[PDB]
Ligand SMILES: Nc1ncnc2c1ncn2[C@@H]1O[C@H](COP(=O)(O)OP(=O)(O)OC[C@H]2O[C@H](O)[C@H](O)[C@@H]2O)[C@@H](O)[C@H]1O
Ligand SMILES: O=c1c(O)c(-c2ccc(O)c(O)c2)oc2cc(O)cc(O)c12
């Protein structure tokens with residue numbers, strides 16, 4: 001067993017050790033709340049509780065490939081409102097940038113498309129955008145698959161014109177991953193390689209409520225420590241009919257057999273602060289936030 005004790009202090013004791021060379025960051029929507037962007041499943045503030053005006057039979061419809069193909073207007077409506085684009089990466093995003101600078105970051109797997117991992121200074125090679133990107137767009141026909149650049153989507157969304165392939169006249173959507181779609185190839189190729197050599201899973205701002213991304217915690221070695229920094233406990237529950245996770249594929253924080261998994265409950269910003277400090281990196285993180293935020297105001 002690699003953790004001297006199931007607390008934040010014993011994770012930072014582990015990170016200082018020789019034995020901790022390669023960290024995989026698994027992140028979700030809660031790393032981007034403190035920078036102004038609401039998540040999906042939080043009650044009342046979550047996007048899923050704020051789609052009434054589309055009179056959707058249920059909220060996940062707006063990001064489902066079959067609902068989309070029949071009623072594409074709801075989604076295109078949201079996508080403009082989705083992207084004001086005036087958002088700064090949080091403390092939590094820089095912490096991952098620090099991991100990069102410390103030679104500690106094997107990868108960050110993100111469920112977000114708000115692009116703040118990239119604006120925080122992680123590179124395309126440090127990053128798997130698990131759930132796609134707005135950067136490019138494609139025709140939804142499997143035989144055509146025509147690609148259109150950021151501008152071409154941008155210009156049809158604020159036209160208020162439902163985008164349509166020039167070649168086949170089918171719907172064109174941004175390369176965000178909808179329910180029913182494939183995840184990009186980079187996800188599997190990186191996965192099969194990355195999880196063979198991982199020493200710490202750091203899991204931030206996610207409810208682990210979708211597959212395949214919720215599988216990732218089960219892919220690390222049985223002895224790899226797994227720290228959650230989240231408002232609630234995520235990945236830990238009694239089985240039920242319709243659970244998302246595999247049998248015994250989840251976190252064990254609290255049971256008598258618990259050995260390697262730690263939950264820190266609270267703000268993603270403050271945990272990252274409290275780990276940095278333990279690790280003696282407080283000022284270094286604060287200074288890089290202060291600088292990088294000044295640097296954006298000015299550009
Ligand atoms: N500041 C905060 N600090 C810590 N945790 C936070 C904070 N704010 C929110 N949380 C927690 O952060 C978590 C947010 O969970 P969810 O909103 O489901 O986001 P996803 O990223 O998992 O959604 C995954 C996919 O589902 C979608 O369809 C798309 O396809 C997404 O890509 C909760 O447990 C919050 O308590
Ligand atoms: O909207 C849907 C939905 O909510 C559920 C579902 C999931 C878990 C549960 O516990 C439950 O009661 C329902 O399944 C679905 C299956 C589909 O093929 C299409 C859908 O649109 C839904």
Ligand SMILES: [Zn+2]
Nearest residue numbers: 139144165168
């Ligand atoms: Zn086409």
